[PDB]
PDB file of C-alpha atoms and ligand atoms in Angstrom:
ATOM      1  CA  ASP N   1     321.829 105.419  49.651  1.00 18.83           C
ATOM      2  CA  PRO N   2     325.307 105.574  48.067  1.00 19.69           C
ATOM      3  CA  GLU N   3     326.991 103.805  51.033  1.00 23.03           C
ATOM      4  CA  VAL N   4     325.183 100.450  50.363  1.00 24.76           C
ATOM      5  CA  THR N   5     324.888  98.389  47.087  1.00 27.41           C
ATOM      6  CA  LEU N   6     323.011  95.025  46.732  1.00 28.81           C
ATOM      7  CA  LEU N   7     325.199  92.228  45.263  1.00 28.85           C
ATOM      8  CA  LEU N   8     322.511  89.430  45.593  1.00 30.75           C
ATOM      9  CA  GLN N   9     318.699  89.319  46.363  1.00 29.95           C
ATOM     10  CA  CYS N  10     317.594  85.692  47.172  1.00 26.03           C
ATOM     11  CA  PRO N  11     314.437  84.145  45.706  1.00 25.69           C
ATOM     12  CA  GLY N  12     311.608  82.257  47.404  1.00 28.98           C
ATOM     13  CA  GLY N  13     311.543  84.525  50.508  1.00 28.63           C
ATOM     14  CA  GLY N  14     315.200  83.530  51.310  1.00 31.01           C
ATOM     15  CA  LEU N  15     317.396  80.406  50.936  1.00 34.32           C
ATOM     16  CA  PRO N  16     317.943  77.694  53.567  1.00 35.20           C
ATOM     17  CA  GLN N  17     321.394  76.121  54.242  1.00 34.84           C
ATOM     18  CA  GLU N  18     320.525  72.963  52.167  1.00 37.44           C
ATOM     19  CA  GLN N  19     320.149  75.062  48.927  1.00 36.12           C
ATOM     20  CA  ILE N  20     323.615  76.747  49.028  1.00 36.58           C
ATOM     21  CA  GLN N  21     326.951  75.460  47.656  1.00 37.77           C
ATOM     22  CA  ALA N  22     330.372  76.984  48.569  1.00 36.83           C
ATOM     23  CA  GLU N  23     333.637  76.708  46.562  1.00 36.48           C
ATOM     24  CA  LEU N  24     336.596  77.514  48.953  1.00 35.33           C
ATOM     25  CA  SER N  25     339.714  77.966  46.727  1.00 35.09           C
ATOM     26  CA  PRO N  26     343.021  79.944  46.827  1.00 37.22           C
ATOM     27  CA  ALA N  27     341.925  81.177  43.322  1.00 37.41           C
ATOM     28  CA  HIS N  28     339.367  83.362  45.310  1.00 38.10           C
ATOM     29  CA  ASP N  29     342.099  85.035  47.469  1.00 38.67           C
ATOM     30  CA  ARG N  30     343.242  88.710  47.343  1.00 37.73           C
ATOM     31  CA  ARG N  31     346.003  89.333  44.726  1.00 40.04           C
ATOM     32  CA  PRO N  32     349.442  90.392  46.110  1.00 37.81           C
ATOM     33  CA  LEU N  33     349.695  94.274  46.181  1.00 36.71           C
ATOM     34  CA  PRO N  34     351.542  95.843  43.179  1.00 36.80           C
ATOM     35  CA  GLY N  35     354.601  97.017  45.276  1.00 34.23           C
ATOM     36  CA  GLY N  36     354.356  93.891  47.508  1.00 35.33           C
ATOM     37  CA  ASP N  37     352.487  92.959  50.732  1.00 33.34           C
ATOM     38  CA  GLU N  38     355.274  94.726  52.761  1.00 33.46           C
ATOM     39  CA  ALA N  39     352.858  97.756  52.944  1.00 31.11           C
ATOM     40  CA  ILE N  40     350.366  95.535  54.957  1.00 30.75           C
ATOM     41  CA  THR N  41     353.158  94.307  57.311  1.00 27.90           C
ATOM     42  CA  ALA N  42     354.265  97.982  57.932  1.00 24.68           C
ATOM     43  CA  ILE N  43     350.674  99.109  58.963  1.00 25.83           C
ATOM     44  CA  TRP N  44     350.361  95.978  61.257  1.00 26.61           C
ATOM     45  CA  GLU N  45     353.769  96.613  62.970  1.00 25.48           C
ATOM     46  CA  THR N  46     352.849 100.333  63.557  1.00 28.97           C
ATOM     47  CA  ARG N  47     349.508  99.245  65.152  1.00 27.84           C
ATOM     48  CA  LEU N  48     351.067  96.475  67.376  1.00 27.52           C
ATOM     49  CA  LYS N  49     353.725  98.945  68.643  1.00 25.97           C
ATOM     50  CA  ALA N  50     350.837 101.132  70.036  1.00 22.99           C
ATOM     51  CA  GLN N  51     348.364  98.309  70.995  1.00 24.82           C
ATOM     52  CA  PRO N  52     350.478  95.149  71.647  1.00 25.14           C
ATOM     53  CA  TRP N  53     347.387  93.228  72.978  1.00 24.70           C
ATOM     54  CA  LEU N  54     345.840  93.076  69.428  1.00 26.43           C
ATOM     55  CA  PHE N  55     345.794  89.696  67.652  1.00 25.84           C
ATOM     56  CA  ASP N  56     345.243  88.584  64.030  1.00 23.32           C
ATOM     57  CA  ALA N  57     342.419  86.177  63.073  1.00 23.23           C
ATOM     58  CA  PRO N  58     341.516  84.408  59.803  1.00 25.12           C
ATOM     59  CA  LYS N  59     338.349  85.438  57.932  1.00 26.59           C
ATOM     60  CA  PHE N  60     336.448  84.197  54.844  1.00 27.03           C
ATOM     61  CA  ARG N  61     336.812  86.362  51.667  1.00 27.25           C
ATOM     62  CA  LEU N  62     333.844  86.849  49.278  1.00 26.02           C
ATOM     63  CA  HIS N  63     334.988  86.653  45.623  1.00 32.73           C
ATOM     64  CA  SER N  64     331.497  86.338  43.984  1.00 33.98           C
ATOM     65  CA  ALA N  65     328.000  84.727  44.375  1.00 30.33           C
ATOM     66  CA  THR N  66     326.071  83.225  41.368  1.00 31.85           C
ATOM     67  CA  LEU N  67     322.274  82.507  41.583  1.00 33.98           C
ATOM     68  CA  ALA N  68     320.727  79.597  39.585  1.00 33.10           C
ATOM     69  CA  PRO N  69     317.917  80.387  37.046  1.00 33.50           C
ATOM     70  CA  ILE N  70     314.784  81.219  39.168  1.00 31.77           C
ATOM     71  CA  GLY N  71     312.288  78.382  39.780  1.00 33.78           C
ATOM     72  CA  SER N  72     314.914  75.612  39.140  1.00 32.63           C
ATOM     73  CA  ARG N  73     315.417  72.347  41.103  1.00 34.61           C
ATOM     74  CA  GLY N  74     318.758  71.608  42.807  1.00 35.49           C
ATOM     75  CA  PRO N  75     321.228  74.024  44.489  1.00 31.13           C
ATOM     76  CA  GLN N  76     320.167  77.675  44.064  1.00 34.34           C
ATOM     77  CA  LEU N  77     323.378  79.649  44.962  1.00 33.75           C
ATOM     78  CA  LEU N  78     327.158  79.189  44.510  1.00 35.88           C
ATOM     79  CA  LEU N  79     329.389  81.217  46.917  1.00 34.84           C
ATOM     80  CA  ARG N  80     333.010  81.582  45.704  1.00 36.47           C
ATOM     81  CA  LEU N  81     335.109  82.113  48.875  1.00 35.77           C
ATOM     82  CA  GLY N  82     338.823  82.576  49.635  1.00 32.22           C
ATOM     83  CA  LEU N  83     340.714  83.232  52.872  1.00 29.12           C
ATOM     84  CA  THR N  84     341.845  86.584  54.349  1.00 25.40           C
ATOM     85  CA  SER N  85     342.553  88.044  57.836  1.00 26.24           C
ATOM     86  CA  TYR N  86     341.992  91.005  60.206  1.00 25.18           C
ATOM     87  CA  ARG N  87     345.639  92.114  59.468  1.00 21.18           C
ATOM     88  CA  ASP N  88     344.989  92.131  55.664  1.00 22.05           C
ATOM     89  CA  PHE N  89     341.720  94.125  56.252  1.00 22.88           C
ATOM     90  CA  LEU N  90     343.631  96.832  58.233  1.00 25.51           C
ATOM     91  CA  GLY N  91     346.266  97.111  55.444  1.00 29.04           C
ATOM     92  CA  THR N  92     343.730  97.327  52.506  1.00 28.36           C
ATOM     93  CA  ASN N  93     339.985  98.134  53.056  1.00 26.70           C
ATOM     94  CA  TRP N  94     340.758 100.266  56.224  1.00 26.91           C
ATOM     95  CA  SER N  95     343.871 101.941  54.651  1.00 26.07           C
ATOM     96  CA  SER N  96     343.733 105.690  53.738  1.00 23.53           C
ATOM     97  CA  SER N  97     344.745 104.543  50.169  1.00 24.90           C
ATOM     98  CA  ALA N  98     341.856 102.021  49.729  1.00 25.56           C
ATOM     99  CA  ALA N  99     340.399 104.058  46.753  1.00 27.66           C
ATOM    100  CA  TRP N 100     343.833 103.921  44.992  1.00 25.48           C
ATOM    101  CA  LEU N 101     343.887 100.086  45.455  1.00 24.22           C
ATOM    102  CA  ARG N 102     340.342  99.903  43.897  1.00 26.47           C
ATOM    103  CA  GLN N 103     341.488 101.958  40.796  1.00 27.07           C
ATOM    104  CA  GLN N 104     344.677  99.765  40.425  1.00 27.82           C
ATOM    105  CA  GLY N 105     342.552  96.572  40.681  1.00 30.32           C
ATOM    106  CA  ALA N 106     340.258  97.853  37.849  1.00 31.59           C
ATOM    107  CA  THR N 107     343.421  98.642  35.720  1.00 35.98           C
ATOM    108  CA  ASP N 108     345.389  95.359  36.407  1.00 32.56           C
ATOM    109  CA  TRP N 109     342.631  92.681  36.871  1.00 28.73           C
ATOM    110  CA  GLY N 110     339.364  94.370  35.662  1.00 30.46           C
ATOM    111  CA  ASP N 111     338.186  93.911  39.295  1.00 29.39           C
ATOM    112  CA  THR N 112     337.872  96.857  41.734  1.00 35.23           C
ATOM    113  CA  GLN N 113     338.183  94.369  44.681  1.00 33.23           C
ATOM    114  CA  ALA N 114     341.324  92.378  43.427  1.00 33.39           C
ATOM    115  CA  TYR N 115     343.738  94.099  45.919  1.00 35.90           C
ATOM    116  CA  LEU N 116     341.228  94.211  48.874  1.00 38.68           C
ATOM    117  CA  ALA N 117     340.942  91.744  51.792  1.00 38.44           C
ATOM    118  CA  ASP N 118     337.069  91.942  51.623  1.00 37.77           C
ATOM    119  CA  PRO N 119     336.307  89.831  54.760  1.00 37.68           C
ATOM    120  CA  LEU N 120     332.729  88.404  54.683  1.00 36.85           C
ATOM    121  CA  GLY N 121     330.406  89.754  57.415  1.00 37.78           C
ATOM    122  CA  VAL N 122     327.097  88.269  58.627  1.00 40.37           C
ATOM    123  CA  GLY N 123     324.048  90.216  59.908  1.00 41.06           C
ATOM    124  CA  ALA N 124     320.466  89.345  60.915  1.00 42.18           C
ATOM    125  CA  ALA N 125     316.980  90.808  60.636  1.00 42.93           C
ATOM    126  CA  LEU N 126     315.913  89.195  63.951  1.00 39.61           C
ATOM    127  CA  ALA N 127     312.070  89.172  64.425  1.00 38.44           C
ATOM    128  CA  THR N 128     310.244  88.688  67.796  1.00 39.28           C
ATOM    129  CA  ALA N 129     307.083  86.605  68.432  1.00 39.88           C
ATOM    130  CA  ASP N 130     305.139  89.973  68.727  1.00 39.72           C
ATOM    131  CA  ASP N 131     306.416  91.175  65.255  1.00 39.58           C
ATOM    132  CA  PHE N 132     309.299  93.617  66.029  1.00 38.71           C
ATOM    133  CA  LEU N 133     312.854  93.699  64.554  1.00 38.37           C
ATOM    134  CA  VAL N 134     315.842  93.968  67.005  1.00 37.94           C
ATOM    135  CA  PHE N 135     318.326  96.934  66.906  1.00 34.98           C
ATOM    136  CA  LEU N 136     321.603  97.561  68.894  1.00 34.70           C
ATOM    137  CA  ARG N 137     323.410 100.867  69.679  1.00 33.71           C
ATOM    138  CA  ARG N 138     327.182 100.833  68.931  1.00 34.07           C
ATOM    139  CA  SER N 139     329.649 102.161  71.552  1.00 32.02           C
ATOM    140  CA  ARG N 140     331.455 105.497  70.814  1.00 28.76           C
ATOM    141  CA  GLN N 141     334.811 103.614  71.532  1.00 25.66           C
ATOM    142  CA  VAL N 142     334.759 101.282  68.408  1.00 25.38           C
ATOM    143  CA  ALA N 143     336.872 102.109  65.279  1.00 27.91           C
ATOM    144  CA  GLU N 144     334.073 101.775  62.620  1.00 28.11           C
ATOM    145  CA  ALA N 145     330.615 103.489  62.797  1.00 31.31           C
ATOM    146  CA  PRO N 146     330.946 104.710  66.441  1.00 28.93           C
ATOM    147  CA  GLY N 147     327.621 105.563  68.059  1.00 29.61           C
ATOM    148  CA  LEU N 148     325.554 104.270  65.073  1.00 27.29           C
ATOM    149  CA  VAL N 149     322.584 101.792  65.107  1.00 27.12           C
ATOM    150  CA  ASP N 150     323.433  98.154  64.095  1.00 27.85           C
ATOM    151  CA  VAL N 151     321.676  94.732  63.846  1.00 28.40           C
ATOM    152  CA  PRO N 152     323.139  91.519  65.412  1.00 30.01           C
ATOM    153  CA  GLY N 153     326.101  90.012  63.522  1.00 30.65           C
ATOM    154  CA  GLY N 154     329.898  89.826  63.179  1.00 32.51           C
ATOM    155  CA  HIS N 155     332.760  88.453  60.986  1.00 36.12           C
ATOM    156  CA  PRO N 156     333.080  84.616  61.194  1.00 36.71           C
ATOM    157  CA  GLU N 157     336.438  82.821  61.638  1.00 38.65           C
ATOM    158  CA  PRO N 158     337.273  79.644  59.628  1.00 37.00           C
ATOM    159  CA  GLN N 159     337.195  76.444  61.888  1.00 38.12           C
ATOM    160  CA  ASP N 160     330.984  70.907  47.896  1.00 41.41           C
ATOM    161  CA  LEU N 161     333.086  68.558  50.138  1.00 43.67           C
ATOM    162  CA  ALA N 162     334.895  71.263  52.149  1.00 43.93           C
ATOM    163  CA  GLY N 163     331.963  73.473  50.813  1.00 44.44           C
ATOM    164  CA  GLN N 164     329.119  72.044  52.954  1.00 42.98           C
ATOM    165  CA  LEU N 165     331.109  72.535  56.198  1.00 46.14           C
ATOM    166  CA  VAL N 166     331.807  76.190  55.219  1.00 47.35           C
ATOM    167  CA  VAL N 167     328.067  76.917  54.517  1.00 46.24           C
ATOM    168  CA  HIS N 168     327.245  75.236  57.887  1.00 43.87           C
ATOM    169  CA  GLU N 169     329.777  77.518  59.712  1.00 41.36           C
ATOM    170  CA  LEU N 170     328.255  80.664  58.074  1.00 38.56           C
ATOM    171  CA  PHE N 171     324.655  79.774  59.193  1.00 37.04           C
ATOM    172  CA  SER N 172     325.905  78.628  62.681  1.00 36.05           C
ATOM    173  CA  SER N 173     327.919  81.883  63.095  1.00 38.43           C
ATOM    174  CA  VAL N 174     324.821  84.172  62.759  1.00 40.19           C
ATOM    175  CA  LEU N 175     323.014  82.168  65.555  1.00 43.80           C
ATOM    176  CA  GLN N 176     326.173  82.175  67.768  1.00 43.86           C
ATOM    177  CA  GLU N 177     326.468  86.038  67.276  1.00 42.15           C
ATOM    178  CA  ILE N 178     322.763  86.421  68.390  1.00 38.43           C
ATOM    179  CA  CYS N 179     323.368  84.173  71.497  1.00 39.21           C
ATOM    180  CA  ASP N 180     326.656  85.991  72.436  1.00 37.32           C
ATOM    181  CA  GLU N 181     325.429  89.652  72.008  1.00 40.06           C
ATOM    182  CA  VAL N 182     321.600  89.509  72.684  1.00 40.11           C
ATOM    183  CA  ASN N 183     322.035  86.760  75.397  1.00 38.79           C
ATOM    184  CA  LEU N 184     319.193  84.611  73.929  1.00 36.97           C
ATOM    185  CA  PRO N 185     318.932  80.825  74.351  1.00 39.22           C
ATOM    186  CA  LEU N 186     319.830  78.971  71.075  1.00 41.06           C
ATOM    187  CA  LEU N 187     316.558  76.951  71.331  1.00 38.42           C
ATOM    188  CA  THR N 188     314.433  80.175  70.980  1.00 40.65           C
ATOM    189  CA  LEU N 189     315.897  80.764  67.406  1.00 41.99           C
ATOM    190  CA  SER N 190     314.693  79.424  63.952  1.00 42.03           C
ATOM    191  CA  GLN N 191     317.196  78.066  61.383  1.00 39.05           C
ATOM    192  CA  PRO N 192     318.349  81.180  59.425  1.00 36.63           C
ATOM    193  CA  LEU N 193     317.296  82.014  55.823  1.00 36.42           C
ATOM    194  CA  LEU N 194     319.797  83.897  53.596  1.00 35.57           C
ATOM    195  CA  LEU N 195     318.064  87.110  52.290  1.00 35.35           C
ATOM    196  CA  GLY N 196     321.000  88.355  50.108  1.00 34.11           C
ATOM    197  CA  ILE N 197     324.438  90.068  50.118  1.00 36.84           C
ATOM    198  CA  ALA N 198     325.039  93.835  50.614  1.00 34.03           C
ATOM    199  CA  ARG N 199     328.298  95.799  50.050  1.00 35.50           C
ATOM    200  CA  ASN N 200     329.539  98.665  52.379  1.00 37.74           C
ATOM    201  CA  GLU N 201     330.924 101.380  50.003  1.00 37.87           C
ATOM    202  CA  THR N 202     332.274 103.324  53.116  1.00 39.35           C
ATOM    203  CA  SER N 203     334.540 100.278  53.866  1.00 39.39           C
ATOM    204  CA  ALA N 204     335.855  99.995  50.206  1.00 37.97           C
ATOM    205  CA  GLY N 205     333.111  97.536  49.165  1.00 36.92           C
ATOM    206  CA  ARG N 206     333.441  94.664  51.734  1.00 38.46           C
ATOM    207  CA  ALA N 207     330.306  92.431  51.647  1.00 39.66           C
ATOM    208  CA  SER N 208     327.995  91.058  54.405  1.00 38.96           C
ATOM    209  CA  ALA N 209     325.587  88.070  54.053  1.00 39.26           C
ATOM    210  CA  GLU N 210     322.199  89.246  55.512  1.00 39.29           C
ATOM    211  CA  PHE N 211     319.911  86.570  57.143  1.00 37.55           C
ATOM    212  CA  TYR N 212     316.310  86.413  58.540  1.00 36.91           C
ATOM    213  CA  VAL N 213     315.947  84.704  61.981  1.00 37.89           C
ATOM    214  CA  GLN N 214     312.676  84.334  63.980  1.00 36.21           C
ATOM    215  CA  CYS N 215     312.670  84.220  67.837  1.00 35.91           C
ATOM    216  CA  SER N 216     309.899  82.534  69.903  1.00 33.57           C
ATOM    217  CA  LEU N 217     310.257  85.275  72.643  1.00 34.08           C
ATOM    218  CA  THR N 218     308.379  88.642  72.696  1.00 32.84           C
ATOM    219  CA  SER N 219     310.209  92.032  72.529  1.00 34.46           C
ATOM    220  CA  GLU N 220     309.776  92.377  76.379  1.00 35.20           C
ATOM    221  CA  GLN N 221     311.344  88.901  76.956  1.00 36.96           C
ATOM    222  CA  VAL N 222     314.265  89.641  74.497  1.00 38.92           C
ATOM    223  CA  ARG N 223     314.932  92.968  76.407  1.00 36.71           C
ATOM    224  CA  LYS N 224     315.005  91.131  79.797  1.00 36.22           C
ATOM    225  CA  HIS N 225     317.544  88.521  78.441  1.00 33.83           C
ATOM    226  CA  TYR N 226     319.841  91.243  76.916  1.00 35.35           C
ATOM    227  CA  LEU N 227     319.792  93.418  80.103  1.00 33.07           C
ATOM    228  CA  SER N 228     320.076  90.466  82.598  1.00 31.91           C
ATOM    229  CA  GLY N 229     323.620  89.856  81.213  1.00 31.64           C
ATOM    230  CA  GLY N 230     324.813  93.261  82.566  1.00 32.39           C
ATOM    231  CA  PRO N 231     327.236  95.700  80.839  1.00 35.91           C
ATOM    232  CA  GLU N 232     330.105  93.123  80.339  1.00 38.64           C
ATOM    233  CA  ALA N 233     327.788  90.580  78.569  1.00 35.10           C
ATOM    234  CA  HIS N 234     327.462  92.802  75.390  1.00 35.55           C
ATOM    235  CA  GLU N 235     329.663  95.103  73.160  1.00 35.01           C
ATOM    236  CA  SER N 236     326.597  97.316  72.320  1.00 37.54           C
ATOM    237  CA  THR N 237     325.381 100.047  74.797  1.00 41.57           C
ATOM    238  CA  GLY N 238     321.618  99.473  74.317  1.00 42.54           C
ATOM    239  CA  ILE N 239     318.815  97.429  72.603  1.00 41.78           C
ATOM    240  CA  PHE N 240     315.542  98.648  71.004  1.00 42.03           C
ATOM    241  CA  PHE N 241     312.672  97.344  68.801  1.00 43.84           C
ATOM    242  CA  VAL N 242     310.739  98.629  65.712  1.00 43.57           C
ATOM    243  CA  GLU N 243     307.383  97.081  64.645  1.00 44.69           C
ATOM    244  CA  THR N 244     307.726  95.177  61.304  1.00 45.87           C
ATOM    245  CA  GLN N 245     304.757  97.408  60.181  1.00 45.50           C
ATOM    246  CA  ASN N 246     307.092 100.474  60.549  1.00 44.93           C
ATOM    247  CA  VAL N 247     310.257  98.839  59.003  1.00 45.18           C
ATOM    248  CA  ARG N 248     308.593  99.242  55.535  1.00 48.62           C
ATOM    249  CA  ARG N 249     309.120 103.103  55.655  1.00 47.24           C
ATOM    250  CA  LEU N 250     312.322 103.198  57.791  1.00 45.68           C
ATOM    251  CA  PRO N 251     314.379 104.856  54.934  1.00 46.33           C
ATOM    252  CA  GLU N 252     311.964 107.876  55.263  1.00 44.77           C
ATOM    253  CA  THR N 253     312.600 108.248  59.100  1.00 43.74           C
ATOM    254  CA  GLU N 254     315.320 110.161  61.081  1.00 42.20           C
ATOM    255  CA  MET N 255     316.577 106.671  62.249  1.00 42.09           C
ATOM    256  CA  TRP N 256     317.932 106.017  58.681  1.00 41.72           C
ATOM    257  CA  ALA N 257     320.764 108.617  59.076  1.00 38.22           C
ATOM    258  CA  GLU N 258     321.883 106.792  62.296  1.00 36.63           C
ATOM    259  CA  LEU N 259     322.023 103.224  60.768  1.00 40.50           C
ATOM    260  CA  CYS N 260     325.475 101.815  59.807  1.00 41.37           C
ATOM    261  CA  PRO N 261     325.733 100.582  56.172  1.00 39.19           C
ATOM    262  CA  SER N 262     325.611  96.797  56.940  1.00 39.67           C
ATOM    263  CA  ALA N 263     322.397  97.349  59.027  1.00 39.21           C
ATOM    264  CA  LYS N 264     320.928  99.399  56.081  1.00 41.75           C
ATOM    265  CA  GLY N 265     321.682  96.332  53.870  1.00 41.11           C
ATOM    266  CA  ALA N 266     319.836  93.974  56.304  1.00 39.67           C
ATOM    267  CA  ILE N 267     316.715  96.245  56.362  1.00 40.70           C
ATOM    268  CA  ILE N 268     316.598  96.824  52.517  1.00 39.14           C
ATOM    269  CA  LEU N 269     316.858  93.023  51.956  1.00 42.12           C
ATOM    270  CA  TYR N 270     314.220  92.266  54.723  1.00 42.31           C
ATOM    271  CA  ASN N 271     311.830  94.721  53.001  1.00 44.94           C
ATOM    272  CA  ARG N 272     312.447  93.266  49.459  1.00 45.72           C
ATOM    273  CA  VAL N 273     312.556  89.509  50.340  1.00 48.10           C
ATOM    274  CA  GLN N 274     310.343  88.971  53.507  1.00 48.01           C
ATOM    275  CA  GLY N 275     308.089  92.075  52.996  1.00 49.20           C
ATOM    276  CA  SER N 276     306.772  93.158  49.509  1.00 47.03           C
ATOM    277  CA  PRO N 277     304.000  90.497  49.129  1.00 46.01           C
ATOM    278  CA  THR N 278     303.310  89.067  45.586  1.00 44.47           C
ATOM    279  CA  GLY N 279     299.834  87.428  46.216  1.00 44.06           C
ATOM    280  CA  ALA N 280     296.207  88.765  46.080  1.00 44.39           C
ATOM    281  CA  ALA N 281     295.484  88.369  49.874  1.00 42.99           C
ATOM    282  CA  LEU N 282     298.588  90.116  51.462  1.00 40.64           C
ATOM    283  CA  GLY N 283     298.637  92.537  48.447  1.00 41.38           C
ATOM    284  CA  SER N 284     295.009  93.768  49.129  1.00 39.83           C
ATOM    285  CA  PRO N 285     294.832  97.544  50.084  1.00 41.52           C
ATOM    286  CA  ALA N 286     293.694  97.073  53.769  1.00 39.90           C
ATOM    287  CA  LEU N 287     296.773  94.765  54.370  1.00 40.04           C
ATOM    288  CA  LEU N 288     299.275  96.710  52.079  1.00 45.29           C
ATOM    289  CA  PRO N 289     298.268 100.383  52.508  1.00 44.82           C
ATOM    290  CA  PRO N 290     299.277 102.617  49.520  1.00 45.05           C
ATOM    291  CA  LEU N 291     302.147 105.186  50.019  1.00 46.52           C
TER     292      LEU N 291
HETATM  293  O1  LIG D   1     341.078  99.717  63.394  1.00 47.41           O
HETATM  294  C1  LIG D   1     340.623  98.665  63.884  1.00 47.41           C
HETATM  295  O2  LIG D   1     341.199  97.997  64.775  1.00 47.41           O
HETATM  296  C2  LIG D   1     339.282  98.191  63.384  1.00 47.41           C
HETATM  297  C3  LIG D   1     338.628  97.133  63.997  1.00 47.41           C
HETATM  298  C4  LIG D   1     337.384  96.727  63.553  1.00 47.41           C
HETATM  299  C5  LIG D   1     336.790  97.363  62.467  1.00 47.41           C
HETATM  300  N1  LIG D   1     335.531  96.973  62.004  1.00 47.41           N
HETATM  301  C6  LIG D   1     334.936  95.664  62.237  1.00 47.41           C
HETATM  302  C7  LIG D   1     335.653  94.556  61.500  1.00 47.41           C
HETATM  303  C8  LIG D   1     335.807  94.623  60.125  1.00 47.41           C
HETATM  304  C9  LIG D   1     336.464  93.615  59.446  1.00 47.41           C
HETATM  305  C10 LIG D   1     336.973  92.535  60.132  1.00 47.41           C
HETATM  306  C11 LIG D   1     336.815  92.455  61.494  1.00 47.41           C
HETATM  307  C12 LIG D   1     336.160  93.460  62.178  1.00 47.41           C
HETATM  308  C13 LIG D   1     337.448  98.412  61.845  1.00 47.41           C
HETATM  309  C14 LIG D   1     338.681  98.829  62.310  1.00 47.41           C
END
């Protein structure tokens, strides 16, 4: 799977909010482009002169994520975050010249991402009470991955002592994205666990945090809530469910070719961190069938 790389796999079956530190610093920002940020302004002006209803929005930037030594007490992850925007994304990661920017960043900074906006996404492996994961079909009208299968998620917008508020907004944002798109009540959702971070090599390496969330509703009840919103309540064009039993071998199915890279990242991390049992009971052959 060349279009997805794992940056981080979390220990312990996934990390809760209380175990993560963030450092939000202008040191973690994109570097100014070699010939100046005028090239970003030119792309933005061209776009607004065709679609004048578009608007910019701020985004968090992922610089790096360092895990503590496994089995240690205290905070287990440090996220190094900067600030970026939708405009900077369109002028860098989504530019036809994104590969040239990656080569220049390796040359100038020893960092293939130094000249890239790299907005941080969030996605969820969302499990039902009857042990299915939730999938969404993307519209054929969207710019990126039209018509492909996705999981719930989005790109959170800004508003350890500014740190703890930023981690809170990341965890809150994945629940809000589930409530807004799947039309579920907030009180049917568990607090998220962070599974890891995946990079989308088709979008010049921008990263998504991938979370596990459990819902107290069955697959039939989740379907009713999603559909009872009507066509204007969701950006997706359909919902469907796969048994967690069957998620284990999803990369061997015809579905795998239809999944967008950030959804591939969510499913690889679900299989490595929530699946893949380590103990004698769940690891026994009748419960973990060979092949
Ligand atoms: O060309 C566009 O307008 C365009 C719009 C979304 C898009 N993808 C989703 C997205 C990525 C990063 C930040 C926010 C959203 C790609 C391209």
